[PDB]
Coordinates of N, CA and C and ligand atoms in Angstrom, one line a residue:
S1 N 88.1 -174.5 -22.1 CA 88.6 -173.1 -22.2 C 89.5 -173.2 -23.4
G2 N 89.1 -173.7 -24.5 CA 89.9 -173.7 -25.9 C 90.6 -175.0 -26.0
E3 N 91.0 -175.8 -25.0 CA 92.0 -177.0 -25.3 C 90.7 -178.0 -25.9
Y4 N 91.2 -179.0 -26.5 CA 90.3 -180.2 -27.0 C 89.6 -180.9 -25.9
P5 N 88.4 -181.1 -25.8 CA 88.0 -181.7 -24.5 C 88.3 -183.1 -24.4
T6 N 88.6 -183.7 -23.3 CA 89.0 -185.0 -23.0 C 88.0 -185.8 -22.0
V7 N 87.9 -187.0 -21.9 CA 86.8 -187.8 -21.4 C 86.4 -187.5 -20.0
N8 N 87.5 -187.1 -19.1 CA 87.0 -186.7 -17.8 C 86.5 -185.3 -17.7
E9 N 86.4 -184.6 -18.7 CA 86.0 -183.1 -18.9 C 84.4 -183.1 -19.2
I10 N 84.1 -184.3 -19.9 CA 82.5 -184.3 -20.3 C 81.8 -185.1 -19.7
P11 N 81.0 -184.9 -18.9 CA 79.9 -185.6 -18.3 C 79.0 -186.5 -19.5
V12 N 78.8 -187.7 -19.2 CA 77.7 -188.4 -20.2 C 76.5 -187.8 -20.0
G13 N 76.0 -187.5 -21.3 CA 74.9 -186.7 -21.6 C 75.3 -185.4 -22.3
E14 N 76.5 -184.6 -22.0 CA 76.7 -183.4 -22.5 C 77.5 -183.5 -23.8
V15 N 77.3 -182.4 -24.5 CA 78.1 -182.5 -25.7 C 79.0 -181.1 -26.0
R16 N 80.0 -181.3 -26.4 CA 81.0 -180.1 -26.6 C 81.4 -179.9 -28.2
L17 N 81.5 -179.1 -28.8 CA 81.9 -178.8 -30.2 C 83.5 -178.0 -30.0
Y18 N 84.0 -178.3 -31.1 CA 85.5 -177.6 -31.1 C 85.6 -177.4 -32.5
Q19 N 85.8 -175.9 -32.6 CA 86.3 -175.3 -34.2 C 87.5 -175.9 -34.6
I20 N 87.4 -176.7 -35.9 CA 88.7 -177.4 -36.3 C 89.3 -176.2 -37.5
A21 N 88.4 -175.5 -38.3 CA 88.8 -174.9 -39.3 C 87.3 -173.9 -39.7
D22 N 87.5 -173.0 -40.7 CA 86.4 -172.4 -41.0 C 85.1 -173.4 -41.6
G23 N 84.2 -173.3 -41.0 CA 83.0 -174.2 -41.2 C 83.3 -175.7 -41.2
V24 N 84.1 -176.0 -40.3 CA 84.3 -177.3 -39.8 C 84.5 -177.5 -38.3
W25 N 83.6 -178.1 -37.7 CA 83.7 -178.4 -36.1 C 84.0 -180.0 -36.0
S26 N 84.4 -180.2 -34.9 CA 84.1 -181.8 -34.2 C 83.1 -181.5 -33.2
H27 N 82.5 -182.8 -32.9 CA 81.7 -183.0 -31.7 C 82.2 -184.0 -30.8
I28 N 82.1 -183.5 -29.5 CA 82.7 -184.6 -28.6 C 81.6 -184.7 -27.5
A29 N 81.5 -186.1 -27.3 CA 80.4 -186.6 -26.4 C 81.2 -188.0 -25.5
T30 N 80.6 -188.4 -24.4 CA 81.1 -189.4 -23.5 C 80.0 -190.4 -23.4
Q31 N 80.4 -191.8 -23.3 CA 79.3 -192.6 -23.0 C 80.0 -193.8 -22.3
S32 N 79.0 -194.6 -21.7 CA 79.4 -195.7 -21.0 C 79.1 -197.0 -21.6
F33 N 80.3 -197.8 -21.7 CA 79.9 -199.1 -22.4 C 80.6 -200.2 -21.7
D34 N 79.9 -201.4 -21.4 CA 80.7 -202.5 -20.6 C 81.3 -201.9 -19.4
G35 N 80.8 -200.9 -18.8 CA 81.3 -200.3 -17.4 C 82.3 -199.5 -17.4
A36 N 82.9 -199.0 -18.6 CA 83.8 -197.9 -18.6 C 83.5 -196.8 -19.5
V37 N 83.9 -195.5 -19.2 CA 83.3 -194.3 -19.9 C 84.6 -193.9 -21.1
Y38 N 84.1 -193.6 -22.1 CA 84.8 -193.3 -23.3 C 84.4 -192.1 -23.9
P39 N 85.4 -191.2 -24.5 CA 84.8 -190.1 -25.4 C 84.7 -190.6 -26.7
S40 N 84.2 -189.9 -27.6 CA 83.8 -190.2 -29.2 C 83.8 -188.7 -29.8
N41 N 84.4 -188.9 -30.9 CA 84.2 -187.7 -32.0 C 83.2 -188.1 -32.9
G42 N 82.9 -186.7 -33.6 CA 81.9 -186.8 -35.0 C 82.5 -185.4 -35.5
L43 N 81.9 -185.1 -36.8 CA 82.2 -184.1 -37.5 C 81.0 -183.2 -37.8
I44 N 81.1 -181.8 -37.9 CA 79.7 -181.0 -38.6 C 80.6 -180.1 -39.6
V45 N 79.8 -180.1 -40.7 CA 80.6 -179.4 -41.8 C 79.5 -178.5 -42.4
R46 N 79.8 -177.2 -42.4 CA 79.0 -176.1 -43.1 C 78.6 -176.6 -44.5
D47 N 77.3 -176.5 -44.9 CA 76.9 -176.8 -46.2 C 76.0 -175.4 -46.9
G48 N 76.5 -174.4 -47.2 CA 75.7 -173.2 -47.2 C 75.3 -172.5 -45.9
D49 N 73.7 -172.6 -45.9 CA 73.2 -172.2 -44.7 C 72.5 -173.6 -44.0
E50 N 72.9 -174.8 -44.2 CA 72.7 -175.7 -43.7 C 73.9 -176.5 -43.0
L51 N 73.6 -177.6 -42.2 CA 74.9 -178.5 -41.8 C 74.7 -179.9 -42.3
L52 N 75.9 -180.3 -42.5 CA 76.1 -181.8 -42.6 C 76.9 -182.3 -41.4
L53 N 76.1 -183.5 -40.9 CA 76.7 -184.3 -39.7 C 77.3 -185.4 -40.0
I54 N 78.4 -185.9 -39.5 CA 79.2 -186.8 -39.4 C 79.2 -187.7 -38.1
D55 N 78.3 -188.7 -38.0 CA 78.0 -189.7 -36.9 C 77.3 -188.9 -35.7
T56 N 76.6 -189.9 -35.1 CA 76.0 -189.6 -34.0 C 76.9 -189.1 -32.7
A57 N 76.3 -188.9 -31.8 CA 77.1 -188.5 -30.5 C 77.1 -189.7 -29.5
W58 N 76.8 -190.9 -30.1 CA 76.8 -192.2 -29.3 C 75.8 -192.3 -28.2
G59 N 74.4 -192.5 -28.8 CA 73.4 -192.6 -27.9 C 72.2 -191.6 -28.0
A60 N 70.9 -191.9 -27.7 CA 69.7 -191.1 -28.2 C 70.0 -189.7 -27.2
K61 N 70.3 -190.0 -26.1 CA 70.1 -188.5 -25.2 C 71.2 -187.7 -25.5
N62 N 72.6 -188.3 -26.0 CA 73.6 -187.7 -26.3 C 73.3 -186.8 -27.5
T63 N 72.9 -187.8 -28.6 CA 72.5 -187.0 -29.9 C 71.3 -185.9 -29.7
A64 N 70.4 -185.7 -28.9 CA 69.4 -184.9 -28.4 C 70.4 -183.7 -28.1
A65 N 71.4 -184.0 -27.3 CA 72.1 -182.9 -26.6 C 73.1 -182.3 -27.7
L66 N 73.5 -183.1 -28.6 CA 74.4 -182.6 -29.9 C 73.5 -181.7 -30.7
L67 N 72.3 -182.0 -31.0 CA 71.5 -181.1 -31.8 C 71.1 -179.7 -30.9
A68 N 70.9 -179.6 -29.5 CA 70.7 -178.7 -28.9 C 72.0 -177.7 -28.9
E69 N 73.1 -178.3 -28.7 CA 74.7 -177.9 -28.6 C 74.7 -177.0 -30.1
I70 N 74.5 -177.9 -31.1 CA 74.5 -177.1 -32.5 C 73.6 -175.9 -32.6
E71 N 72.5 -175.9 -32.1 CA 71.7 -174.9 -32.2 C 72.0 -173.6 -31.2
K72 N 72.7 -173.8 -30.1 CA 73.2 -172.9 -29.5 C 74.4 -172.2 -29.9
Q73 N 75.5 -173.0 -30.3 CA 76.7 -172.6 -31.0 C 76.5 -172.1 -32.4
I74 N 76.0 -172.6 -33.3 CA 76.1 -172.6 -34.6 C 74.7 -171.8 -35.3
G75 N 73.6 -172.6 -34.9 CA 72.3 -171.8 -35.2 C 72.0 -172.2 -36.7
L76 N 72.4 -173.2 -37.2 CA 71.9 -173.6 -38.7 C 71.5 -175.0 -38.6
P77 N 70.4 -175.3 -39.3 CA 69.8 -176.7 -39.2 C 70.7 -177.5 -39.8
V78 N 70.7 -178.9 -39.0 CA 71.3 -180.1 -39.6 C 70.3 -180.7 -40.4
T79 N 70.6 -181.0 -41.9 CA 70.0 -181.6 -42.7 C 70.2 -182.8 -43.1
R80 N 71.3 -183.4 -43.0 CA 71.7 -184.4 -43.2 C 72.8 -185.1 -42.5
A81 N 72.9 -186.4 -42.1 CA 74.0 -187.1 -41.4 C 74.4 -188.4 -42.2
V82 N 75.8 -188.6 -42.0 CA 76.4 -189.7 -42.5 C 76.9 -190.5 -41.4
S83 N 76.7 -191.7 -41.4 CA 77.3 -192.6 -40.1 C 78.4 -193.4 -40.9
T84 N 79.7 -193.3 -40.4 CA 80.7 -193.9 -40.7 C 81.1 -195.5 -40.6
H85 N 80.2 -195.9 -39.7 CA 80.5 -197.5 -39.5 C 79.2 -197.9 -38.7
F86 N 78.8 -199.1 -38.5 CA 77.9 -199.6 -37.9 C 77.6 -199.6 -36.4
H87 N 78.7 -199.3 -35.7 CA 78.6 -199.4 -34.1 C 77.8 -198.2 -33.6
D88 N 77.7 -198.3 -32.4 CA 76.7 -197.6 -31.8 C 77.2 -196.1 -31.5
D89 N 78.6 -195.8 -31.5 CA 79.2 -194.5 -31.4 C 79.0 -193.9 -32.7
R90 N 78.5 -194.4 -33.7 CA 78.2 -193.9 -35.0 C 76.9 -193.7 -35.5
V91 N 76.0 -194.9 -35.2 CA 74.4 -194.8 -35.4 C 73.7 -194.8 -34.2
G92 N 74.1 -194.8 -33.1 CA 73.3 -194.8 -31.9 C 72.9 -193.4 -31.7
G93 N 71.5 -192.8 -31.9 CA 71.1 -191.8 -32.0 C 70.4 -191.6 -33.5
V94 N 70.6 -192.3 -34.2 CA 70.1 -192.1 -35.8 C 68.5 -191.9 -35.6
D95 N 67.8 -192.5 -34.7 CA 66.5 -192.6 -34.6 C 66.0 -191.1 -34.1
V96 N 66.8 -190.5 -33.1 CA 66.5 -189.0 -32.8 C 66.9 -188.2 -34.0
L97 N 67.7 -188.3 -34.7 CA 68.2 -187.6 -35.7 C 66.9 -187.6 -36.8
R98 N 66.5 -188.6 -37.4 CA 65.4 -189.0 -38.0 C 64.2 -188.2 -37.6
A99 N 63.9 -188.2 -36.3 CA 62.7 -187.4 -35.8 C 62.9 -186.0 -35.5
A100 N 64.2 -185.5 -35.9 CA 64.4 -184.2 -35.8 C 64.4 -183.5 -37.2
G101 N 64.1 -184.4 -38.3 CA 64.2 -183.8 -39.7 C 65.4 -184.0 -40.5
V102 N 66.2 -184.7 -39.9 CA 67.7 -185.1 -40.6 C 67.5 -186.3 -41.3
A103 N 68.0 -186.4 -42.6 CA 68.1 -187.3 -43.5 C 69.3 -188.0 -43.2
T104 N 69.3 -189.4 -42.8 CA 70.3 -190.2 -42.5 C 70.8 -191.1 -43.4
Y105 N 72.0 -191.3 -43.7 CA 72.8 -192.1 -44.7 C 73.8 -192.9 -44.2
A106 N 74.0 -194.1 -44.8 CA 75.2 -194.7 -44.6 C 75.5 -195.9 -45.7
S107 N 76.6 -196.5 -45.9 CA 76.7 -197.5 -46.9 C 75.7 -198.6 -46.8
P108 N 75.4 -199.2 -47.7 CA 74.6 -200.4 -47.7 C 75.3 -201.6 -46.7
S109 N 76.6 -201.5 -46.7 CA 77.3 -202.6 -45.8 C 77.1 -202.0 -44.4
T110 N 77.2 -200.7 -44.0 CA 76.8 -200.5 -42.9 C 75.3 -200.5 -42.4
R111 N 74.5 -200.4 -43.4 CA 73.0 -200.5 -42.9 C 72.8 -202.1 -42.7
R112 N 73.3 -202.9 -43.6 CA 73.0 -204.2 -43.1 C 73.7 -204.7 -41.9
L113 N 75.1 -204.4 -41.5 CA 75.8 -204.7 -40.2 C 74.8 -204.3 -39.3
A114 N 74.3 -202.8 -39.1 CA 73.6 -202.2 -38.2 C 72.1 -203.3 -38.0
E115 N 71.5 -203.4 -38.9 CA 70.6 -204.1 -38.8 C 70.7 -205.6 -38.1
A116 N 71.8 -206.2 -38.5 CA 72.0 -207.6 -38.0 C 72.2 -207.7 -36.5
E117 N 73.0 -206.4 -36.1 CA 73.3 -206.4 -34.7 C 72.5 -205.6 -33.9
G118 N 71.4 -205.3 -34.4 CA 70.3 -204.5 -33.6 C 70.5 -203.3 -33.3
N119 N 71.4 -202.7 -33.9 CA 71.8 -201.2 -33.7 C 70.7 -200.2 -34.6
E120 N 70.6 -198.9 -34.6 CA 69.8 -198.0 -35.4 C 70.4 -198.1 -36.8
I121 N 69.2 -197.7 -37.6 CA 69.8 -198.0 -39.2 C 69.4 -196.7 -39.9
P122 N 70.5 -196.0 -40.5 CA 70.2 -194.9 -41.3 C 69.4 -195.3 -42.3
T123 N 68.5 -194.2 -42.8 CA 67.4 -194.4 -43.8 C 68.1 -194.7 -45.1
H124 N 69.1 -194.1 -45.7 CA 69.4 -193.8 -47.1 C 70.8 -194.5 -47.4
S125 N 70.8 -195.3 -48.3 CA 72.0 -196.2 -49.0 C 72.9 -195.3 -49.6
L126 N 74.1 -195.4 -49.2 CA 75.4 -194.6 -50.0 C 75.9 -195.6 -50.9
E127 N 75.5 -195.6 -52.2 CA 76.2 -196.5 -53.3 C 77.7 -195.9 -53.7
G128 N 78.1 -196.8 -54.4 CA 79.4 -196.2 -54.8 C 80.7 -196.3 -54.2
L129 N 80.4 -197.0 -52.9 CA 81.6 -197.2 -51.9 C 81.9 -198.6 -51.6
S130 N 81.6 -199.5 -52.5 CA 81.7 -200.8 -51.9 C 83.1 -201.4 -52.3
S131 N 84.1 -200.9 -53.1 CA 85.4 -201.4 -53.3 C 86.4 -200.4 -52.8
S132 N 87.4 -200.9 -51.9 CA 88.4 -200.1 -51.5 C 89.0 -199.4 -52.4
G133 N 89.2 -198.1 -52.2 CA 89.8 -196.9 -53.0 C 88.4 -196.2 -53.4
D134 N 87.4 -196.5 -53.2 CA 86.1 -195.9 -54.0 C 86.0 -194.6 -53.1
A135 N 85.5 -193.6 -53.8 CA 85.1 -192.2 -53.3 C 83.9 -191.6 -54.1
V136 N 83.0 -190.8 -53.4 CA 81.9 -190.1 -53.6 C 81.9 -188.9 -53.2
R137 N 81.2 -187.7 -53.8 CA 81.0 -186.4 -53.1 C 79.7 -186.6 -52.3
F138 N 79.7 -185.9 -51.1 CA 78.3 -185.8 -50.4 C 78.4 -184.5 -49.7
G139 N 77.5 -183.4 -50.5 CA 77.8 -181.9 -49.9 C 79.0 -181.7 -50.1
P140 N 79.6 -181.0 -48.9 CA 80.7 -180.5 -48.9 C 81.9 -181.4 -48.5
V141 N 81.8 -182.7 -48.5 CA 82.9 -183.4 -48.2 C 82.9 -184.6 -49.4
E142 N 84.0 -185.1 -49.3 CA 84.3 -186.7 -50.2 C 84.3 -187.8 -49.1
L143 N 83.5 -188.6 -49.4 CA 83.5 -190.0 -48.5 C 84.4 -191.0 -49.1
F144 N 85.1 -191.8 -48.6 CA 86.2 -192.6 -49.0 C 86.2 -194.0 -48.4
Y145 N 86.2 -195.0 -48.9 CA 86.1 -196.4 -48.4 C 87.6 -197.0 -48.5
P146 N 88.4 -197.0 -47.5 CA 89.7 -197.5 -47.6 C 89.9 -198.7 -47.6
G147 N 88.9 -199.5 -47.4 CA 89.2 -201.1 -47.0 C 88.9 -201.3 -45.8
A148 N 88.9 -202.6 -45.2 CA 88.6 -203.0 -44.0 C 89.7 -202.6 -42.9
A149 N 89.3 -202.3 -41.6 CA 90.2 -201.9 -40.7 C 89.6 -202.0 -39.3
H150 N 89.2 -200.8 -38.6 CA 88.4 -201.0 -37.6 C 87.3 -201.9 -37.7
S151 N 86.6 -201.7 -38.7 CA 85.5 -202.4 -39.2 C 85.6 -202.8 -40.6
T152 N 84.8 -203.7 -41.4 CA 84.8 -204.0 -42.9 C 84.2 -202.8 -43.5
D153 N 83.3 -202.0 -43.0 CA 82.5 -201.0 -43.6 C 83.1 -199.4 -43.1
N154 N 84.0 -199.3 -42.3 CA 84.4 -198.1 -42.0 C 84.7 -197.2 -43.3
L155 N 84.2 -196.1 -43.1 CA 84.3 -194.9 -44.1 C 85.0 -193.8 -43.3
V156 N 85.9 -193.0 -44.4 CA 86.7 -191.9 -44.0 C 86.1 -190.6 -44.7
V157 N 86.2 -189.5 -44.0 CA 85.8 -188.2 -44.9 C 86.6 -187.2 -44.7
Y158 N 86.5 -186.6 -46.0 CA 87.6 -185.5 -46.3 C 86.9 -184.1 -46.6
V159 N 87.3 -182.8 -45.8 CA 86.8 -181.7 -46.2 C 87.4 -181.2 -47.2
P160 N 87.4 -180.9 -48.5 CA 88.5 -180.2 -49.3 C 88.7 -178.8 -49.2
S161 N 87.7 -178.0 -48.7 CA 87.9 -176.8 -48.4 C 89.1 -176.4 -47.2
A162 N 89.1 -177.3 -46.3 CA 89.9 -177.1 -45.3 C 91.0 -178.1 -45.2
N163 N 91.2 -179.1 -46.2 CA 92.2 -180.1 -45.9 C 92.1 -180.8 -44.5
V164 N 90.6 -181.2 -44.0 CA 90.4 -181.8 -43.0 C 90.2 -183.2 -43.3
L165 N 90.9 -184.2 -42.7 CA 90.7 -185.7 -42.7 C 90.0 -186.0 -41.4
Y166 N 89.0 -186.6 -41.7 CA 88.1 -187.4 -40.5 C 88.3 -188.8 -40.7
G167 N 89.1 -189.4 -39.8 CA 89.2 -190.8 -40.2 C 88.4 -191.8 -39.5
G168 N 87.6 -191.3 -38.6 CA 86.7 -192.0 -37.8 C 87.7 -193.2 -37.2
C169 N 86.9 -194.3 -36.7 CA 87.6 -195.4 -35.9 C 88.5 -196.3 -36.7
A170 N 89.0 -196.0 -37.9 CA 90.0 -196.5 -38.5 C 91.2 -195.8 -38.2
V171 N 91.2 -194.7 -37.4 CA 92.4 -193.7 -37.1 C 92.4 -193.6 -35.8
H172 N 93.6 -193.7 -35.0 CA 93.6 -193.7 -33.5 C 94.4 -192.3 -33.4
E173 N 94.3 -191.8 -32.2 CA 95.1 -190.5 -31.7 C 96.6 -191.0 -31.3
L174 N 97.2 -190.0 -31.2 CA 98.7 -190.3 -31.0 C 99.0 -190.9 -29.5
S175 N 98.2 -190.7 -28.6 CA 98.4 -191.4 -27.3 C 98.0 -192.8 -27.2
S176 N 97.5 -193.4 -28.3 CA 96.9 -194.6 -28.5 C 97.9 -195.9 -28.0
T177 N 97.7 -196.7 -27.3 CA 98.8 -197.9 -27.2 C 98.4 -199.2 -27.6
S178 N 96.9 -199.1 -28.2 CA 96.3 -200.4 -28.4 C 95.3 -200.1 -29.8
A179 N 94.9 -201.2 -30.3 CA 93.9 -201.0 -31.4 C 92.6 -200.8 -30.9
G180 N 92.4 -200.3 -29.6 CA 91.1 -200.2 -29.2 C 90.1 -201.3 -29.4
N181 N 88.6 -201.1 -29.6 CA 87.9 -202.3 -29.7 C 87.9 -203.0 -31.1
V182 N 88.7 -204.1 -31.2 CA 88.8 -204.8 -32.3 C 88.3 -206.1 -32.7
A183 N 87.0 -206.4 -31.9 CA 86.2 -207.4 -32.2 C 85.9 -207.7 -33.7
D184 N 85.6 -206.6 -34.4 CA 85.0 -206.4 -35.7 C 86.1 -205.8 -36.7
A185 N 87.2 -205.9 -36.2 CA 88.4 -205.3 -37.1 C 89.0 -206.5 -38.0
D186 N 89.8 -205.9 -38.8 CA 90.5 -206.8 -39.6 C 92.2 -206.2 -39.5
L187 N 92.9 -206.8 -38.4 CA 94.2 -206.4 -38.2 C 95.3 -206.4 -39.2
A188 N 94.8 -207.7 -40.1 CA 95.8 -207.8 -41.2 C 95.7 -206.8 -42.4
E189 N 94.4 -206.4 -42.5 CA 94.2 -205.5 -43.9 C 94.3 -204.1 -43.4
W190 N 94.1 -203.8 -41.9 CA 94.2 -202.3 -41.3 C 95.3 -201.4 -41.9
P191 N 96.7 -201.9 -41.6 CA 97.8 -201.3 -42.3 C 97.6 -200.8 -43.9
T192 N 97.1 -201.8 -44.6 CA 97.1 -201.5 -45.9 C 95.8 -200.5 -46.1
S193 N 94.7 -200.6 -45.5 CA 93.8 -199.6 -45.6 C 94.2 -198.1 -45.1
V194 N 95.0 -198.1 -44.1 CA 95.7 -196.6 -43.7 C 96.6 -196.2 -44.9
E195 N 97.3 -197.1 -45.5 CA 98.3 -196.7 -46.5 C 97.3 -196.0 -47.9
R196 N 96.2 -196.6 -47.9 CA 95.5 -196.1 -48.9 C 95.0 -194.7 -48.8
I197 N 94.6 -194.4 -47.3 CA 94.3 -193.0 -46.8 C 95.5 -192.1 -47.1
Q198 N 96.6 -192.6 -46.6 CA 97.7 -191.8 -46.9 C 98.2 -191.5 -48.3
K199 N 97.8 -192.3 -49.1 CA 98.3 -192.2 -50.6 C 97.0 -191.1 -51.1
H200 N 95.8 -191.5 -50.7 CA 94.8 -190.5 -51.4 C 94.6 -188.9 -50.8
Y201 N 95.1 -188.7 -49.4 CA 95.0 -187.5 -49.1 C 96.4 -187.0 -48.5
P202 N 97.3 -186.8 -49.3 CA 98.7 -186.4 -48.7 C 98.7 -184.8 -48.5
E203 N 97.5 -184.2 -48.7 CA 97.6 -182.8 -48.2 C 96.8 -182.5 -47.1
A204 N 96.4 -183.4 -46.5 CA 95.5 -183.3 -45.2 C 96.4 -182.4 -44.1
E205 N 95.9 -181.5 -43.6 CA 96.3 -180.7 -42.6 C 96.1 -181.0 -41.2
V206 N 94.8 -181.4 -41.0 CA 94.2 -181.7 -39.8 C 93.6 -183.2 -39.8
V207 N 94.1 -184.2 -38.8 CA 93.5 -185.6 -38.9 C 92.5 -185.7 -37.6
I208 N 91.6 -186.3 -37.8 CA 90.6 -186.2 -36.4 C 90.4 -188.1 -36.4
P209 N 90.8 -188.3 -35.1 CA 90.5 -189.8 -35.0 C 89.1 -190.2 -34.6
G210 N 88.7 -191.2 -34.4 CA 87.3 -191.5 -33.9 C 87.0 -191.3 -32.5
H211 N 88.1 -191.3 -31.7 CA 88.1 -191.1 -30.2 C 89.4 -190.5 -30.2
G212 N 89.4 -189.2 -29.4 CA 90.8 -188.5 -29.0 C 91.0 -187.2 -29.6
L213 N 92.3 -187.1 -29.6 CA 92.8 -185.7 -29.9 C 93.2 -185.7 -31.3
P214 N 92.6 -184.6 -32.2 CA 93.2 -184.5 -33.5 C 94.6 -184.1 -33.6
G215 N 95.2 -184.3 -34.5 CA 96.5 -184.1 -35.0 C 96.8 -183.8 -36.5
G216 N 98.0 -184.2 -37.1 CA 98.2 -184.0 -38.3 C 98.5 -185.3 -38.9
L217 N 99.1 -185.5 -40.0 CA 99.2 -186.8 -40.7 C 99.7 -187.8 -40.1
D218 N 100.8 -187.6 -38.9 CA 101.1 -188.5 -38.0 C 100.2 -189.5 -37.5
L219 N 98.9 -189.0 -37.4 CA 98.0 -190.1 -36.5 C 97.9 -191.5 -37.6
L220 N 97.9 -191.2 -38.7 CA 97.8 -192.4 -39.9 C 98.9 -193.3 -39.5
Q221 N 100.2 -192.8 -39.7 CA 101.2 -194.1 -39.4 C 101.4 -194.6 -38.0
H222 N 100.9 -193.5 -37.1 CA 100.9 -194.1 -35.7 C 99.9 -195.3 -35.7
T223 N 98.6 -195.2 -36.3 CA 97.7 -196.2 -36.2 C 98.4 -197.2 -36.7
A224 N 98.8 -197.2 -38.0 CA 99.4 -198.5 -38.7 C 100.4 -199.3 -37.7
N225 N 101.3 -198.5 -37.0 CA 102.0 -198.8 -36.3 C 101.4 -199.6 -35.0
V226 N 100.4 -199.2 -34.5 CA 99.9 -199.8 -33.3 C 99.1 -201.1 -33.7
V227 N 98.6 -200.9 -34.7 CA 97.7 -202.2 -35.1 C 98.8 -203.2 -35.6
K228 N 100.0 -202.7 -36.3 CA 100.9 -203.9 -36.6 C 101.5 -204.5 -35.5
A229 N 101.5 -203.7 -34.1 CA 102.3 -204.4 -33.2 C 101.3 -205.2 -32.3
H230 N 100.0 -204.6 -32.4 CA 99.0 -205.4 -31.6 C 98.7 -206.8 -32.3
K231 N 98.4 -206.9 -33.4 CA 98.5 -208.3 -34.3 C 99.8 -209.1 -33.8
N232 N 100.8 -208.4 -34.0 CA 102.1 -209.3 -33.6 C 102.3 -209.6 -32.3
Ligands
XMU301 C1 80.7 -198.5 -29.6 C2 81.8 -199.2 -29.7 N1 81.4 -200.8 -30.0 C3 82.6 -201.6 -30.4 O1 83.6 -201.1 -30.9 C4 82.1 -203.1 -30.6 C5 81.0 -203.6 -29.8 C6 80.7 -204.7 -30.0 C7 81.3 -205.8 -30.7 C8 81.0 -207.1 -30.7 N2 79.3 -207.3 -30.7 C9 82.4 -205.3 -31.4 C10 82.6 -204.1 -31.2 C11 82.9 -199.2 -28.7 C12 82.7 -199.4 -27.4 C13 83.5 -199.2 -26.2 C14 84.6 -198.5 -26.3 C15 85.2 -198.4 -27.9 C16 86.3 -198.1 -28.5 C17 87.6 -197.7 -27.9 C18 88.4 -196.4 -28.2 C19 89.5 -196.3 -27.5 C20 89.9 -197.1 -26.6 C21 91.3 -196.8 -25.8 N3 91.0 -196.2 -24.6 C22 90.8 -197.2 -23.6 C23 90.6 -196.9 -22.1 O2 91.5 -195.7 -21.8 C24 92.6 -195.2 -22.8 C25 92.2 -195.5 -24.2 N4 89.3 -198.3 -26.4 C26 88.1 -198.4 -26.9 C27 86.1 -197.9 -30.1 C28 87.1 -197.8 -31.0 O3 88.3 -198.2 -31.0 O4 86.5 -197.2 -32.2 N5 84.9 -198.5 -30.1 C29 84.2 -198.7 -29.1
ZN302 ZN1 83.7 -199.1 -34.0
ZN303 ZN1 84.8 -196.1 -32.2

């Protein structure tokens, strides 16, 4: 009923959208992994009379449900998608998207890692993002590679029209107490990567984590803090 939707409020298989700003929504879905249930966020950005999608809804059937929810609530076609790292909460559902006419994109790093892991593989490579601090335009967003954090390939997305920073899994929600799933992470570089984000997007008004509740710029410092303390 208007609050940001949380894990116990979304059955697995259903997707909710949340209006962030004019022409910007998050998408929220839930999935089982290793016997526990988790929420996950992505982004939708209006691109004229089309939509740009950031990240799948974590699975084939969740992603089909995402497309249906978008048609119900927004009614414009998703034409392109970007996956912000190689994990299943970002690429699982890419095959569904491709079969629905969506052109799927990711960095070459992400594509390699997805292929090696046996995850779904976006079709098109995003060049120009291989060095930390790199940025490229993609429709109504800027894609930014901050350096290794949650994963070596993680990208962040900025919506300049709305000052919305989508951190993906490199950014945690304020209630976080732990670095999350860190098997592919670089705990030593993660604070430095977050500091790059802080420096590059000082006007961000909304910060959206990969999982959990959006907030403001404090999510960035909080993330750095949690990661440093976890490593320690
Ligand atoms: C899809 C993704 N696969 C991986 O990561 C992965 C998988 C395999 C390998 C090595 N082959 C390496 C990495 C993933 C799965 C499950 C939970 C997560 C989480 C996550 C997010 C938040 C929390 C904190 N909650 C815990 C319970 O209650 C309160 C808060 N825990 C885990 C993330 C993420 O941190 O981005 N990704 C996940
Ligand atoms: Zn991940
Ligand atoms: Zn994640």
